[PDB]
Design a protein around this ligand. Structure first.
Ligand SMILES: *[C@](=O)([C]([C][C][C][N]C([N])=[N])[N]C(=O)[C]1[C][C][C][C]1)C1=NC2=C([C]=[C][C]=[C]2)S1
Ligand SMILES: [Ca+2]
Length: 223
């Protein structure tokens, strides 16, 4: 996250870190046994880490659970990143408490202008590299589809939406992928992609979660 702020130990209890010997992507806990992330974050040997603040220090509230199965969206396209969403099942149910909670799925889509909270352990510099050990947060509004498509002509689909500031300075970045975008208490987006980080006229692109609620609910119920 570039231009954001330190969230504070477990102020985002649904935020998880995907670990394959090191943090590589973010994720969102939707219930005791399931996590939602980006399909482009897929890989074998995934260990889900919950209740994390400083990902390089054991503070006492973390829960490390191995993934039993991964399900990338059936129509995920790695070239265009269309349908960039995947489900990850926990080998054993997570212990839900205060630092470890799930985030509700949307009942309907959010509109442009709506403010959301984007979080992650990704790069914090837009013209360099510096990865944080503590969870970073950023409040950003959903941008009009017109400004989104204008910024990325011929690249935006109905399964994506832009959020951030066209003036640059605040945005998600490498390391934040798969992470949450929560608007009005609902998981409306997943950190997907963008051109650079916090660059003017280049907002972050997020997977439009509201389009996948049926698939998510049906897939989880059948697995
Ligand atoms: C993701 O954190 C990044 C997101 C950058 C967000 N940029 C904004 N908001 N301007 N995604 C990427 O680097 C790409 C998307 C598809 C291919 C590359 C990460 N996801 C992964 C990373 C490393 C390894 C695997 C997935 S960083
Ligand atoms: Ca920790």
């Amino acid at each position: 996250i570039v231009g954001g702020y330190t969230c504070g130990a477990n102020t985002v209890p649904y935020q998880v870190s995907l670990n394959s010997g090191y943090h590589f992507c973010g994720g969102s806990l939707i219930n005791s046994q399931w996590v939602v992330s980006a399909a482009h974050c897929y890989k074998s040997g995934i260990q889900v880490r919950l209740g994390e603040d400083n990902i390089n220090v054991v503070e006492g509230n973390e829960q490390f659970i191995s993934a039993s199965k991964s399900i990338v969206h059936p129509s995920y396209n790695s070239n265009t990143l269309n349908n960039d969403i995947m489900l990850i099942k926990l080998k054993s149910a997570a212990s839900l408490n205060s630092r470890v909670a799930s985030i509700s799925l949307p009942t309907s889509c959010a509109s442009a202008g709506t403010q959301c909270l984007i979080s992650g352990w990704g790069n914090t510099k837009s013209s360099g590299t510096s990865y944080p050990d503590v969870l970073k947060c950023l409040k950003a509004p959903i941008l009009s589809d017109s400004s989104c498509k204008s910024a990325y002509p011929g690249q935006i689909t109905s399964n994506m939406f832009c959020a951030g500031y066209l003036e640059g300075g605040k945005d998600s970045c490498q390391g934040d992928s798969g992470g949450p975008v929560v608007c009005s208490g609902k998981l409306q987006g997943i950190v997907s992609w963008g051109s650079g980080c916090a660059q003017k006229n280049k907002p972050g692109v997020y997977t439009k979660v509201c389009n996948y609620v049926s698939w998510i609910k049906q897939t989880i119920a059948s697995n």
